[PDB]
């Protein structure tokens, strides 16, 4: 077994502590790996704090009794992902052992307001006989929103799918709605709204189909 | 500088057999090397799986080993791995990757005492069900008149019912990266996944600039070049 | 005047043991002022050969001189030059006989080596080298691809050929495996000639020098 935990905070440029748990860290020590969505995991200390070429020096490690530790000095936004402790038993048939992974999230960050861009259904795809609206939400901190949609001024649930924040390649988070009309609804109506809610605010986008 | 590749079916029929390889450049599978296999269930963690040393036989998880087969083949210079009696529980990005040697007795410098990855592949996306593929619809998201943020103008492309994941998109060939994002997918009643992509472009580009989304669909053999043009 | 040894050996001064802090080596010396030990001066457990021969052949010395003989970034390309050892520490730290070079696999392979020096010296030159002795057979083949390995040495005066021992053993400095250090003297405009496709401890500085 090998057990670490699954989420830990630290304030952007502060110093961040990730420990993992077991009894296999004695003898083939421990190895860390950064694992972001859509990308393989990267090795970025083993052994007795060595770390790859291209890692940066603000990661060390270090390892007590059965206890090793990944430390992020200066943490910055770009540090922000799940880290898995790795073994190697010595018992037995000597298996390879993973931690349970532990969170990373960078706080102190600067607050934006999402932008919002409501796109109508397009002329091909109500050629089609099919529409859908799409609400994409963008560079908003932090990443939590809450999204609302709107035929007219009456309140819409039906065919919504919303996806969950995700982080943009400048550290700042992207969501997206979908709202699924027949052709005859789409036209039916005067105008359709997309509601984003973020910190307590709210931006609101309408489209029309005249 | 070895470099590893996994290629494999993105989906199998439930109690199918998975089977995957990973290609080997710049080294060689004759080696003291451990290849190894992970993988990464949607919502959980790395899943170590097996691996294998030419010429010094295989090790596997215990929760696995029962329906999990690893292999080489020398001549093509790859490794392989099969896993038989899928369910839904088998469903995860698979990952190929290398083991350096270890030792395990006092007769070897230090570096040999320590466990670590050194390599590792992409990862391919597998998923267990008895639905059918489905190729994707894609529909532009054209900028309109009073989509624009002044000098800067959100275009897209919308990619429509495909099974299963996952779908790539890039722009204009990869010469277009700056201000792209590519939205996760959603999970309609119909089984079938959609997506977004959007790019940030200057409004005064719009009637000169060409702009086409290339959508990537491995789980299809499908690539989609679509124009975007204004309203 | 005589080679002032200090704390160490000459084993282990003439190898390059880390912990001799003892100063780098004069031009001449009528005599050697040593400290016998009993674990020799092999931080690796070992059996040094002929160590009687060289004991007195380097008790007298006229033109000694320490040169790199397999520059370590160079002579060895696509093998691992880096091997350190908790055996040999040095301030703490692992390391290795500043004399030789431990060559291990690189990216899971031990290609066949070969390399040759000319003695140029216009004198006798001493060379050294050792062969390395796992206590398994799995850690042959983790550190040098090869199971059934050879290291051969010849120059024109000396021909031996070497096969590994796997044996398991005691624990000497906390260590199982087993470095057997070898050594010849190589006559002006002679050549030398290391060949192994695994265990060689591989010549890093060899020295230059005149008996009397
Ligand atoms: C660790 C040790 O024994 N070091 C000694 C050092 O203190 C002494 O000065 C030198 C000769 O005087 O011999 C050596
Ligand atoms: C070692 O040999 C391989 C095989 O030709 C070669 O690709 C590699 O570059 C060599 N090592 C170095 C350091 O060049």
């Known amino acids: 077994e090998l057990t670490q935990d699954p989420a830990v905070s630290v304030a952007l440029g502060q110093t961040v502590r990730i420990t993992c748990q077991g009894d296999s860290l004695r003898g083939y020590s421990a190895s860390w790996y950064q694992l972001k969505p859509g990308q393989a995991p990267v090795l970025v200390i083993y052994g007795k704090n060595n770390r790859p070429s291209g890692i940066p020096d603000r990661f060390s490690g270090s390892t007590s009794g059965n206890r090793a530790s990944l430390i992020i000095t200066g943490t910055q936004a770009e540090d922000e992902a799940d880290y898995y402790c790795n073994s190697r038993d010595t018992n037995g048939y000597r298996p390879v052992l993973f931690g349970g992974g532990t969170k990373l999230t960078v706080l102190g960050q600067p607050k934006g307001a999402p932008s919002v861009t409501l796109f109508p259904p397009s002329s091909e795809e109500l050629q089609a006989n099919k529409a859908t609206l799409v609400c994409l939400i963008s560079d908003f901190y932090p990443g939590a929103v809450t999204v609302a949609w709107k035929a007219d001024s009456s309140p819409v649930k039906a065919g919504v799918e919303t996806t969950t924040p995700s982080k943009q390649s400048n550290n700042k988070y992207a969501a997206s709605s979908y709202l699924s009309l027949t052709p005859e609804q789409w036209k039916s109506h005067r105008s359709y709204s997309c509601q984003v809610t973020h910190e307590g605010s709210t931006v609101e986008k309408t489209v029309a189909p005249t | 500088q070895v470099q590893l590749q996994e290629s494999g079916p993105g989906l199998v029929k439930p109690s199918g057999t998975l089977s995957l390889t990973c290609a080997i450049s710049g080294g060689s599978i004759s080696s003291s090397n451990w290849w190894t296999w992970v993988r990464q269930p949607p919502g959980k963690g790395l899943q170590w799986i097996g691996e294998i040393q030419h010429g010094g036989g295989t090790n596997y998880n215990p929760s696995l080993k029962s329906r999990a087969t690893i292999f080489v083949d020398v001549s093509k210079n790859h490794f392989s791995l099969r896993l038989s009696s899928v369910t839904a529980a088998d469903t995860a990005v698979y990952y190929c990757?290398?083991?350096?040697?270890?030792?395990?007795?006092?007769?070897?410098?230090?570096?040999?005492?320590?466990?670590?990855?050194?390599?590792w592949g992409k990862g391919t996306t597998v998923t267990v069900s008895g639905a059918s593929t489905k190729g994707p619809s894609v529909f532009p998201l054209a900028p309109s008149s009073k989509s624009t943020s002044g000098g800067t103008a959100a275009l897209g492309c919308l990619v429509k019912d495909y099974f299963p994941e996952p779908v790539t998109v890039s722009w204009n060939s990869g010469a277009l990266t700056s201000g792209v994002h590519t939205f996760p997918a959603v999970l309609q009643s119909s089984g079938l996944y959609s997506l977004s992509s959007v790019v940030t472009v200057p409004s005064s580009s719009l009637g000169t600039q060409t702009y086409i989304c290339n959508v990537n669909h491995k789980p299809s053999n499908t690539k989609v070049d679509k124009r975007v043009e204004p309203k | 005047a005589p080679l002032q040894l200090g704390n160490c050996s000459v084993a282990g001064w003439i190898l390059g043991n880390p912990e001799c802090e003892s100063l780098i080596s004069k031009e001449s010396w009528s005599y050697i002022v040593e400290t016998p030990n009993p674990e020799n001066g092999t931080c690796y457990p070992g059996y040094f050969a002929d160590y009687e021969e060289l004991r007195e052949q380097l008790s007298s010395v006229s033109s000694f001189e320490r040169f790199e003989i397999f520059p370590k970034e160079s002579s060895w390309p696509n093998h691992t030059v880096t091997g350190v050892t908790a055996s040999c520490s040095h301030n703490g730290k692992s390391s290795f006989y500043r004399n030789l070079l431990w060559l291990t696999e690189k990216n899971g392979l031990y290609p066949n080596l070969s390399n040759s020096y000319v003695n140029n010296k216009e004198k006798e030159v001493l060379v050294l080298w050792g062969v390395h002795h796992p206590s398994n057979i799995r850690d042959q083949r983790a550190i040098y691809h090869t199971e059934n390995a050879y290291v051969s040495v010849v120059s024109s005066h000396y021909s031996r050929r070497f096969t590994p021992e796997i044996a398991k053993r005691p624990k000497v400095r906390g260590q199982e495996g087993r470095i057997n250090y070898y050594w010849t003297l190589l006559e002006p405009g002679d050549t030398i000639i290391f060949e192994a496709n695994g265990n060689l401890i591989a010549p890093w500085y060899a020295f230059a020098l005149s008996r009397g």
């Open positions: 990757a290398k083991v350096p040697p270890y030792c395990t007795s006092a007769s070897c410098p230090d570096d040999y005492y320590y466990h670590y990855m050194d390599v």
